[PDB]
């Protein structure tokens, strides 16, 4: 038994599932994925925050965004609603008509994830399961359903585990003031301790009704219930060991870390277990307002995977579903290549270990990432290099044998120096993906 | 006036009544009584507490085991009422239909009990007055009757003093994971402000409505609201100067301390006010398991009572009705033969202090138990010895006179060494019944 | 045992002794002694706050007193002393050199006192006993030596109870700046974390030195240091179970309360243990000052005495000793003449307890006070009637014998109307000394 | 950088150093160990606590004792140095004119040990390096010489990890009772502001003078000088990142945790990292009354070192030199035949990992333990078995190739049944030291 205390809530570690499995999916869908709109300004950390909930790309953020007159949303907004429409109208129009869990399912399985978080409530404050704290849900508006419980079933049945994403610093049924700027989140929030309570009982709610593998906080704990966490976490340990929380609760606990877009992203080896979150394009939440100019192509997101996984974390893909249930193709098919990516590779990734580096790159730039598999460590090229002679940069071997991942085919170096040279047959080469690699063996 | 603070509360002490009343009738009656159904384990204190939970001999616990799938009462529940029947059911089914509260009250009078407290809220949370904060209490549901308001008046007619009894410490309606260890006492409680609040209004609604001679709350009180109990008390204590508070709120102040079966029972004098509880069998709630060979004779009554009064304490007996509200036979005759015990030797108990030393024994193993009264003190032997000649070992009187107490018949007595030696005429010996009881003045 | 926390600490009750104990002497010496000058102004709570620090007739306040220029001392001092001697200077004018403790234990124990408490350490913060952590004490400076120590030897020697005085709120050693009005006291005191450390240590070597039978701290205790407290009384009461504490720390424990001249003074029975507290004048520290125009006489201290003692109290009365060690006569004589009433109506005092009520008055008007002793109840009159009929207005009585106390003399009574009327032969009546005292048996 | 807040600190964990590491020294050294002295009762967890403190079998715990009259040490004092010969006193005999730390590091290395704890400051508060903070130190008296620095010099010399134990919790330095009973902890402490400055002064200087790799603080941190943790831990890391930190400071963070003889010892797989700690006798401090009889047997020795390392724990062997600076023969010569049987196969105990399992039997009954590297598992019999058909209940392997660990024969083997049948040919059998070692390869 953990008992409720930091001290003791110490002994649980992320555990091992989390660590091997190395991709999820994240899925913001809400009524907010009605209007789906947003101006893709541009990606977190990089746009100037006087700006950015002016201009918000986080097409979630949309309830904010119109409560900003004059705000692009707004004027988009009373251009097609118009201004006698509410926010909270779309709960009405949020019908999830053509949605099947199943085939949400089986397209997260075949994109090579392992684990999958939708939000059961985001910062509007709609819940997507039929709590029993507030008529603002699922079961009472709109789907007139269970979409937390069945999507459960559904990526369980697929094999796959289960988390929940639950927005417990924020919740916009009780405040009315927007939020303008970085600073307005200081004193902005619903503050009381019947929100507190309101957090904890629904949280436990998710808990008792899906024991989820993960419980995913966003935007911190409110003050007021944060010695509740020591409670609740105690609580879910002991019903699920193998359960693991984030670092979003700004409690003294937490089983690994987060980094979104720009923010907080590890340069090189953190040294604790962590994962990236990004969307697909530039928002959350469904934005009709992106093209492909706004998304990753697979390619980079392969990229992405791989940096991210040799720097010991997970990657957690976003999609943002439309509001009747849909997976944008856009999306749909950048997820596929990603799977088939995975169903090649997926040997130099999946349960793999952090390495001594997590980088290198070659006499002529392309970037490289390595992992670890006990003796077996994988060598991934960003890319594929056009020469069959191969200069890394920095990095020598006492390995004595090194294979073409692929083939399986021996191939032959040697330390130069500094430097170490592989010589890669171009058939073999040319028999790659997106990225060339390599495993060698000591 | 006290003020809400714990230095001035402090000036609150025990109250003459209740340290010269000594004994007291507790009463858990509740829609626990209706199923009225518990494994009789054994003791607290004696039973292992890692099987505790699972053969819990409480009665009053039988929620807390049906949630425990696989426990004696949840077999035993399905086999009897079926899953598809919810505890809360019993709240319809409790209907106190040959309840009479005069009827209780003339019994604890007879049993020579000086004060009763019923079990306003137990553990289950279902509340036996007409609260304005909860719809699941006895007004609304089965007994449709003010069950607290009504004993209170029956027992102030008949002269005896009246408090009630708050579970404080737990409450089911607000938690869904049942109690299986004793560390999961630590985490598994309401938790919340609102249920902070909740206590201290119902208990605050009980002094309104009542005025109650004793809060008796149990299980501790709300980390979230302990420090609501420096007003509650000040409030309390300006309209009740009299009335008092027992150990069992987890705060620096009480009047009188606690000891449950064989948890915290002082082995000699303590030295502060304290009161002992327990039930006539192994449970507090009734339960139709017991047989006579699971309760204290007669006999046993008297030897408890005697030893709690003789280290300063009061007897908390408990006595547990039916659903139907009548008290079952083996416990009313127990409680008469009590009462008839009471009568005779009444006068070495009440209104009582205690002595330089609480026990004794004869040479041949016969317990024995001092009290006093001013000059006087009575002696008690926990059975009527057999020969003339007592001998009680470590004891010398610089008294001069002896008293056979019920004849009052002076005695032959005389120090012996470290030993003193009292002859009791058999036809005396005869005549008490189930104490010898002799009275020394000095 | 008991543990360091404020819920087991409420176990400890005011001992026996100090109950029984009805009178103790309290001793106001130290550096301040040597002056021994100040305004006797008038009795604390008759005294206009607005002048007090500036007139104070307290002469142990002299090192406060003194930096307030223009202020009586201050002119007295710059006449006596001159502007260059520095207050500490008096430490090696403290010599002490006509000091026999064992004479003063005689004189205590002549005067009817039970128990004797010195000043450790005033609010000058010289202390009077070779502690280890500051030089400013007596067995470097003045004396060379450790006159709490030889005082305790002697107290004991004479059989009396031995407790402390500590001022823990005040050290005039840690500050600059004098006490002007009473709002001064809220900012200007030593404040700091070694201040607290400080005197808990100091404390606690006084209790491993010589364990005192009364820990007696005046003016708060540093907020700093109120936790240490729970630590301080486990480790004390642990030592000493009989052991006892007043109630001026600020903290939720303490076992007597107190009054001081008229500050705090109860009008009638309290329901709790308290002491009243003042000098034999208008000061604590010897005062040269003072005549016997400022003192109590005999008669004002018997009826002080019985006045508090009839209310539940003891009375700590307060002696103050010259620099050299001796008593002046005028404090001598009163103590003398007090310790003769005490010789002739000490049962009447010693070991009793409060009645159902304090006083009463004669028809024409003098006060009468009660105690008692089980059964026997003890009438004092305030003085000695003149008539030989005696009307007590507003008491009745069930006894059925009154008794001329220091003859055993029944006398003559009945009830007549709301009072009772009693017939005194002046014989008798001219036996008594200071007061009537009358004896009923109930 | 780590920051001073716990959130940041769990970033760090146990490093793998540590973790690899699986054996450790730890040194019980001081003024106590002059008398070397104790009543060799029995181990911590079998003895009751009621009589522990009395009987007291760490002879580091002397000065306790000693302050304990009738006390077998107080007893044994008094005919050997005299009442009037104080504790402090034998810092004065502690010469240590024997002592050789390279001989010291030498034979560390020789027992197979990776890491060194030596006590810099026990209960006692005797330092044993020239902190600036006390003058009761080992530079100032007794040695004359820094023994922390040159430890730290000779054991890093010989290529060992060096680590610092620390009494945080206890030091009699600021304390005059005894401890008596377990109880007796909770308020018999320094308690002080100057005490929790102190102990974060002196643990800065350990760091800033020797920047060890653990930091092994015991009985707890004062409560006054918890925050300070946040602070001093983010030093520490952030000046030595691979520094590691137990779990006896009463605060969020730690990087191992702790048991000692029974207590908190795991019957399995803890699911964290920690350590085992024993004496080789019942004593941490020399004790001249230990035999053979009290001492672990070089077989015991390698038994636990298995049964830890393969619960994922490191065990921290104790050792208690003599006054001189010698180290007993009875210890050396445990230390030197554990050394042997490490030699022999230290393989499959050194940076090994716990398996699936830690524990299995024989079909009559011998102890087994796992340990793993990679795909290979280790098998460790407690014992070599006598017939060459050797069954393990309750195991089957998806192998193929299970090994001789010191030959490395192929050895034959099926899976029969629930069980697992092997043949260890007796040449071989007779050729294990005190375990059958099997390597099995899946
Ligand atoms: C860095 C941060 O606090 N982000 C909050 C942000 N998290 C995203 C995963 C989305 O759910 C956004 O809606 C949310 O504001
Ligand atoms: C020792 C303790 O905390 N007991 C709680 C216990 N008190 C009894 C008098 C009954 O009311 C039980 O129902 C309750 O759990
Ligand atoms: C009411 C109060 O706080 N009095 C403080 C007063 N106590 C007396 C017994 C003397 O020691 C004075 O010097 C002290 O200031
Ligand atoms: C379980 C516990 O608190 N043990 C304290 C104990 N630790 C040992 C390693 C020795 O240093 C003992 O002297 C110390 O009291």
């Given at each position: 038994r953990y008992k409720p205390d930091w001290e003791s809530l110490r002994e649980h570690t992320v555990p091992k599932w989390f660590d091997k499995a190395k991709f999820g999916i994240f899925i913001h869908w809400g009524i907010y994925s009605v209007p789906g709109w947003a101006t893709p300004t541009g990606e977190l950390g990089k746009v100037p925050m006087d700006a950015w909930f002016f201009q918000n790309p986080y097409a979630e953020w949309y309830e904010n965004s119109l409560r900003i007159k004059e705000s692009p949303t707004w004027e988009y907004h009373v251009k097609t609603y118009g201004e006698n429409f509410e926010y909270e109208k779309f709960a009405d129009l949020f019908?999830?008509?053509?949605?099947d869990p199943q085939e949400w399912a089986d397209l997260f399985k075949k994109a090579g994830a392992k684990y999958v978080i939708p939000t059961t409530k985001h910062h509007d404050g709609f819940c997507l399961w039929g709590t029993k704290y507030t008529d603002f849900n699922s079961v009472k508006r709109g789907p007139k359903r269970d979409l937390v419980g069945d999507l459960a079933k559904a990526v369980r049945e697929a094999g796959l585990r289960f988390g929940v994403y639950y927005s417990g610093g924020l919740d916009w049924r009780f405040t009315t003031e927007p939020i303008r700027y970085p600073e307005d989140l200081s004193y902005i929030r619903p503050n009381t301790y019947e929100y507190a309570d309101y957090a904890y009982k629904q949280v436990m709610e998710l808990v008792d009704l899906y024991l989820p593998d993960v419980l995913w906080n966003d935007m911190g704990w409110p003050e007021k219930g944060k010695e509740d966490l020591k409670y609740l976490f105690a609580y879910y340990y002991n019903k699920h060991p193998e359960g693991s929380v984030n670092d979003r609760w700004g409690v003294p606990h937490w089983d690994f870390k987060t980094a979104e877009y720009h923010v907080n992203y590890p340069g090189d080896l953190p040294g604790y277990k962590w994962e990236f979150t990004r969307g697909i394009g530039l928002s959350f939440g469904y934005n009709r307002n992106e093209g492909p100019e706004h998304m990753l192509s697979v390619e980079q997101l392969v990229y992405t995977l791989v940096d991210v996984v040799s720097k010991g974390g997970n990657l957690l893909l976003n999609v943002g579903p439309k509001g009747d249930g849909t997976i944008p193709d856009l999306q749909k098919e950048r997820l596929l290549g990603l799977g088939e990516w995975l169903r090649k590779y997926g040997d130099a990734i999946y349960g793999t270990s952090v390495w001594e580096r997590c980088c290198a790159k070659t006499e002529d730039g392309t970037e490289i990432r390595f992992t670890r598999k006990c003796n077996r460590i994988f060598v991934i090229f960003l890319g594929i290099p056009t020469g069959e002679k191969i200069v890394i940069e920095d990095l020598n071997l006492s390995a004595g044998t090194v294979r073409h991942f692929l083939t399986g085919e021996r191939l032959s170096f040697k330390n130069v120096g500094k430097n170490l040279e592989i010589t890669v047959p171009k058939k073999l080469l040319e028999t790659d993906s997106i990225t060339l690699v390599l495993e060698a063996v000591e």
């Open positions: 019908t999830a008509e053509k949605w």
